[PDB]
Design a protein around this ligand. Structure first.
Ligand SMILES: O=C([C@H]1CCCCN1C(=O)COc1ccccc1)N1CCc2ccccc2C1
Length: 627
């Protein structure tokens, strides 16, 4: 059939009974805020911040918190953070390229010949539409984090829990140490896009649409991937239509419209209004409502750096950046997903990514020897055309200028550290995640001499409409440990260094568990600030403190995930003087993909990260420190 999964348990089965996202006590939030400030501030700075926190906790902060609790009690169907968080990204006026949109790249098909461009674009597209159908039919297995898979992730459990009424089902999972996740964002994977509007953008979805959008050399094509009965179009016909598009010989347009999706949102909002005034509403609606955007690039990947640049931003002509996601397939079959950040936290993208990789490689729709259907693709594929005024052509030229200058300032580098990974670190009783984070702190101290604001994302999707919470990896323990390794490397014994790493690991574990349970401080303080500003209050003094600004100017911005489908991921720094650090600790090795703008150097930072990991592993093995 048209489904890539046949879940015994309905996809949304746990959604009605997910626990409510907790709001921390204000006293706990202020202590945690101060703990994270300790390694960042000097003594006088810290004293001033401590005084502000005291005043906040007994003054306006106590009143904002009371209002927050009352609001949350009235809005028990949702979380306190979800709305304010969407609002933050949709109101932001900055370009979504680099600033917000990340990418994940697929591993190749292990069967070499299946990485032909036409073959792979066909197989990935068909698997993606099979995912759409599976999700819509409620046949996708619910998202569930298992602590004890042998007891919870079985057919016996599934056949039972399906009969448990939706209002009790979460408790059933809880009893076997399994934690169902929120899935309310998943629908925006398909038929969805971000529409630029003055002041605040909007998210648009049309679940009726049946066509795919394809971009090639800056030209837009659409054709049906679902038929009038809602069944997936014959994969050999999809192959024919993609062959037709690949055979187009038209050169890149003089004014490629895709450039506009990279603009400042107020600029793009106005230009889109001009496009509609000039009669392009029907064409825009076809772009907005397509199942997703498939991008066929007409060059192969030279190496991992070229790959990262291509998938993170490309050349500006061949991505519709507003779309929920862009599925990109290069001439050598290299494939990735570039996605718009505002519509969700990315867990849906990872689930999509994983199922599509599995389905397209284990049960591919077509083979490299498959002959395309005998169809008349000129009748079934529409080539879109935009009526462009003189004002629009000038806008596209201006958009291209801004895009080209910015993109040129970005550098990217990667490393594959093959000395060891999770297996070794676990034998040493350390958290592998804590060890990676320690290495970044150590590298920054060694190369730049500072301890700086550091961000690590953590999911709060165990809760109803849960989102993310910030783990703050820069602690008094990592600062102490980094200084031990770096300032005078021969100073401490290996036993002392092992003890210090064990402290970092223990504390990082505590912060991780707290964050996953909604007990970080960042979202709580953000929600109080949002409540103040929404009610037109003067910003409380806590938020005017340079320390607060510094804590939210994340020089080290990091993210990780674990998946056999993902070759690497990437994202640009979130501040001009920052790094964007994507990493993964595998069983036997560690990978990092780091971006920087002109003010820093990603490759040089990874020289240092490599040195720091060698140091850490040496000490763990009981070897004397060496250069
Ligand atoms: O594995 C984790 C944590 C801790 C290790 C770093 C990555 N984690 C993340 O949450 C990553 O979260 C994001 C979210 C959005 C974008 C990037 C990364 N948990 C944390 C809690 C939790 C909750 C539900 C299901 C599994 C886990 C395991």
């Amino acid at each position: 059939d048209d489904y890539l999964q046949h879940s015994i348990v309905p996809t949304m089965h746990y959604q009605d009974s997910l626990p409510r996202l907790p709001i921390p006590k204000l006293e706990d939030t202020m202590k945690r805020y101060l703990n994270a400030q300790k390694p960042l501030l000097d003594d006088s700075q810290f004293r001033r911040t401590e005084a502000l926190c005291k005043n906040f906790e007994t003054g306006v902060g106590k009143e904002l918190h009371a209002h927050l609790l009352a609001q949350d009690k009235q809005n028990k169907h949702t979380s306190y953070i979800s709305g304010p968080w969407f609002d933050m990204y949709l109101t932001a006026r900055d370009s979504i390229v680099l600033n917000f949109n990340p990418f994940m790249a697929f591993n190749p098909d292990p069967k070499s010949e299946y990485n032909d461009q036409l073959t792979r674009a066909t197989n990935l597209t068909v698997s993606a539409v099979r995912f759409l159908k599976t999700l819509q039919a409620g046949l996708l297995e619910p998202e569930v984090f298992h602590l004890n898979p042998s007891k919870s992730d079985t057919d016996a459990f599934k056949r039972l829990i399906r009969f448990v009424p939706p209002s009790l089902s979460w408790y059933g999972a809880y009893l076997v140490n399994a934690y169902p996740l929120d899935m309310s964002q998943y629908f925006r994977l398909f038929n969805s896009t971000r529409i630029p509007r003055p002041n605040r953008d909007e998210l648009f979805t049309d679940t009726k649409a049946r066509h795919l959008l394809v971009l090639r050399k800056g030209h837009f094509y659409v054709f049906d991937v679902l038929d009038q009965d809602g069944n997936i179009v014959n994969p050999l016909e999809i192959q024919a239509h993609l062959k037709y598009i690949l055979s187009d010989s038209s050169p890149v347009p003089e004014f490629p419209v895709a450039y506009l999706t990279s603009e400042n949102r107020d600029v793009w909002a106005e230009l889109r209004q001009k496009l509609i005034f000039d009669g392009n509403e029907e064409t825009l609606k076809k772009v907005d409502s397509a199942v997703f955007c498939l991008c066929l690039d007409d060059f192969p990947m030279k190496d991992l750096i070229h790959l990262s640049h291509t998938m993170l931003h490309g050349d500006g002509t061949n991505r519709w950046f507003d779309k929920s996601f862009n599925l990109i397939v290069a001439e050598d079959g290299t494939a990735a997903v570039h996605f718009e950040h505002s519509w969700g936290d990315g867990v849906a993208v990872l689930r999509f990514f994983n199922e599509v990789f599995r389905d397209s490689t284990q049960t591919p729709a077509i083979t490299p020897q498959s002959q395309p259907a005998a169809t008349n693709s000129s009748a079934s594929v529409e080539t879109l055309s935009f009526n462009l005024s003189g004002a629009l052509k000038a806008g596209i030229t201006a958009a291209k200028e801004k895009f080209d200058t910015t993109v040129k300032t970005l550098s990217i580098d990667s490393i594959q550290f093959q000395r060891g990974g999770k297996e070794f670190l676990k034998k040493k009783q350390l958290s592998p995640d804590a060890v990676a984070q320690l290495a970044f702190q150590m590298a920054f101290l060694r190369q730049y001499g500072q301890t700086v604001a550091t961000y690590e994302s953590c999911s709060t999707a165990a809760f109803k409409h849960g989102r993310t919470e910030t783990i703050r990896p820069a602690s008094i323990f990592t600062k102490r440990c980094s200084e031990a390794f770096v300032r005078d490397p021969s100073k401490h014994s290996v036993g002392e260094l092992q003890h210090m790493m064990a402290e970092c690991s223990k504390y990082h574990g505590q912060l991780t568990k707290e964050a996953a349970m909604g007990q970080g401080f960042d979202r709580h303080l953000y929600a109080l600030r949002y409540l103040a500003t929404a009610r037109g209050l003067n910003l409380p003094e806590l938020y005017l403190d340079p320390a607060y600004q510094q804590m939210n100017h994340n020089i080290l911005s990091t993210s990780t995930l674990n998946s056999p489908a993902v070759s690497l991921g990437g994202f640009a720094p979130v501040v001009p003087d920052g790094f964007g650090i994507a990493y993964a600790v595998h069983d036997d090795w560690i990978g990092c993909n780091v971006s920087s703008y002109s003010g820093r150097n990603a490759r040089e930072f990874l020289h240092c990260v490599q040195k720091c990991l060698e140091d850490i592993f040496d000490a763990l093995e009981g070897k004397a420190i060496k250069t």
